[PDB]
Amino acid sequence: MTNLQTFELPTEVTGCAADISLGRALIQAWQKDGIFQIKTDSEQDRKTQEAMAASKQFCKEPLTFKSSCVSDLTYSGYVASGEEVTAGKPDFPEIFTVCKDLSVGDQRVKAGWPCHGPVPWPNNTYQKSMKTFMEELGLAGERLLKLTALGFELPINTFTDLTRDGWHHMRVLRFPPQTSTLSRGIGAHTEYGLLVIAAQDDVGGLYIRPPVEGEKRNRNWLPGESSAGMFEHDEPWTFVTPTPGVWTVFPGDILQFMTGGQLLSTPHKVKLNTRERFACAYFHEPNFEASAYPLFEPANERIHYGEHFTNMFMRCYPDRITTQRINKENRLAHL
Ligand SMILES: NC(=[NH2+])NCCC[C@H](N)C(=O)O
Ligand SMILES: O=C(O)CCC(=O)C(=O)O
Ligand SMILES: [Fe+3]
């Protein structure tokens, strides 16, 4: 809580002795702190700062242009400050969401799969910066998933077998400065996939909740057990202090389900600061068609990830044209 643990990942994870020891240490760090940091090399750091710069430049565009970067096929594109709701309350960052960039010629888009479509990019320079960043983030996610399997003494590709053509996506965020009566950036929530890899500038605002002995956690993938808003005003909340040259990593709903709670989907929230805050949250996700399964309970329960993703994003954006078209064309009922 006072100081987060920081790890260096190897370029390749093969299953050697050092890989197993590192994977164990990563799991223990999650089980104690709910989060850890990983050191970035010069290339990872450059691509991070390049993405932040593109984010700041895009936010300087007029609102009428930013609001035009929307799609009714995919949730990729702009989200205005105040548009997204968490636990019914408006969240206040402006966001650009980057999901899998699929042309209208892609077979899944022609088949009308929910959430599948081309990103409404503001320009190609912004596109190149975000795609390059997400390639680098994906390499880290695969390393982390192999180390996580090794740390549980599972076959090395237990999780990466679910992430071939994974539904990886990213939220490019700018939080506005606070007012005297409003400091809620995003309410307490958990993410939906396997891993969250996050970067931030030096302003500060992210808080996470570590595992708490005796504290039962809602299973955000079940009806009536949303994690949105839970524990929001009760300690403990660890401040994720801005630290140069690191990314933060914590698990999502799928890891909690697959490990039977031995890993918890880390609740987190953002408070507005006295200055605007830029951050990027990347989500290393299963394939949209993947079905996650219990690893430690020899059980019929499954999570169809794509269904979880679509359910979650419709609850984030009930009035977005993407949500309207899913309802109008029964795209989720179809799924
Ligand atoms: N699309 C997201 N990842 N949103 C993160 C914030 C929480 C989200 N509004 C929810 O209700 O679950
Ligand atoms: O602001 C951050 O660092 C993370 C924001 C976040 O949790 C999210 O967008 O899901
Ligand atoms: Fe989040």
Pair of tokens at residue 321: 């044209």
Report which ligand 2 atom has the smallest distance to the Cα of 196: 10
Pair of tokens at residue 117: 């479509």
Q: How deeply is 172 buried, as exposed, middle or buried, from its count of CB atoms within 10 A (0-12, 13-18, 19+)? A: buried
DSSP for 152-213 reads TT--TTTTGGG-TT---EEEEEEEPPP-SS--EEEEEE--SSSEEEEEE-SS--EEE----T
Instruction: Give the SS3 label for residue 145.
Output: helix
DSSP for 43-92 reads HHHHHHHHHHHHHHHHHTS-HHHHTT---SS-S-EEE-TTTSEETTEEP-
| Side chain identity at residue 115, one-letter code | C
Expressed in Å, this structure's resolution amounts to 2.0
Q: Any known ligand binding at 116?
A: no
DSSP for 245-266 reads TEEEEEE-HHHHHHTTTSS---
Ligand 1 centroid to Cα of residue 154, in Å, is 30
Query: Does residue 171's CB lie within 6 angstroms of at least one atom of ligand 2?
Result: yes
Distance CA 113, CA 121 (A): 20
Q: Any known ligand binding at 284?
A: no
For tokens 């680098």, the residue is: 136
- Cα 104 → chain centroid: 25
Structure method: X-ray
Q: Characterize 275-311 residue by residue with b for buried, 16 or more Cβ atoms within 10 angstroms of its Cβ, and e for exposed.
A: ebbbbbbbbbbbbbebebeebeeeeeeebbbbbbbbb
Query: Nearest ligand, CA of residue 189?
Result: 1
Of 38, 55, 43, 50, nearest to 278 (Cα)?
Answer: 55
Assess if CATH 2.60.120.330 describes domain 62-334.
yes
Task: Give the HSE-up count for residue 162: Cα atoms under 13 Å, Cβ half-sphere.
Answer: 28
Pair of tokens at residue 255: 């890891």
Radius of gyration over every alpha carbon of the chain, rounded to an integer in angstroms: 19
| Side chain identity at residue 279, one-letter code | A
Structural domain spans, the chain:
62-334
DSSP, res 304? E
Ligand 3 centroid to Cα of residue 269, in Å, is 7
Helices 124-151/17-33 angle, 10° precision: 100
Ligand 1 centroid to Cα of residue 228, in Å, is 8
